[PDB]
Amino acid sequence: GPIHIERYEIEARDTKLGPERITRDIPHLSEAALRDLDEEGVVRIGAEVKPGDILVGRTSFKGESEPTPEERLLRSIFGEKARDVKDTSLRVPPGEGGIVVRTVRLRRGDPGVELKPGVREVVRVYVAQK
């Protein structure tokens, strides 16, 4: 019986709306949903992941017509720091899951690292399927 190891991947890229970021600091998520994430937002080795569970936390800035009108005013008034990010995390797909066995994280500008044009960072998670 061969063990099935999946390779999951997510990129945080530069965007016209501002940078995507790999992080643990994700809005609208319960403590339980964040439970197995390291301080970077990357799921810990040894964790059991099931469909819908987070492997890698990510947030992105919202599109133009997403915020409410009051939220558009607040931005204009208080500045570009008064913007709400949204949850764009890497989640375990339907019908998959298992145990996290390895992670890899690379950052643009580190020595020897060459990422796609636009990519600030990339994280891969390996899961041994059950």
């Binding site: 643990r24 600091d25 809005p27 319960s30 403590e31 390291d38 301080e39 970077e40 947030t59 208080f78």
Partner: protein
């Protein structure tokens, strides 16, 4: 406080750069706050933070929740509630419990 130090320190560590956290104040907009269920918590005024512990990308804080009132001495920011929380590098507050409302 101590059980919240426990929860916080159980966040797995990682070699990364130190983040610069958002020191929210009576002067500034409070950041988005969430209860442990994931529900948005909307404060009735600004907050102040007191750092208890920190790692690289997250810190533990005591969050003091204020409300404005027009008492005898004019406009005042007055304490309304408090909650322990962790804060991340988007400045977001993740509450460990619903805020405890302070008795007058």
């Amino acid at each position: 406080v101590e059980p919240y130090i426990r929860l916080f320190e159980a966040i797995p560590d990682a070699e990364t750069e130190l983040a610069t956290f958002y020191d929210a104040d009576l002067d500034t907009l409070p950041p988005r706050m969430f209860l442990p269920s994931g529900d948005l918590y909307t404060p009735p005024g600004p907050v102040r933070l007191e750092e208890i512990k920190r790692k690289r990308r997250v810190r533990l804080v005591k969050v003091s929740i204020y409300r404005f009132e027009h008492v005898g001495l004019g406009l005042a920011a007055r304490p309304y509630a408090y909650a322990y929380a962790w804060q991340g590098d988007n400045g977001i507050l993740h509450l460990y419990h619903a805020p405890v409302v302070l008795e007058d």
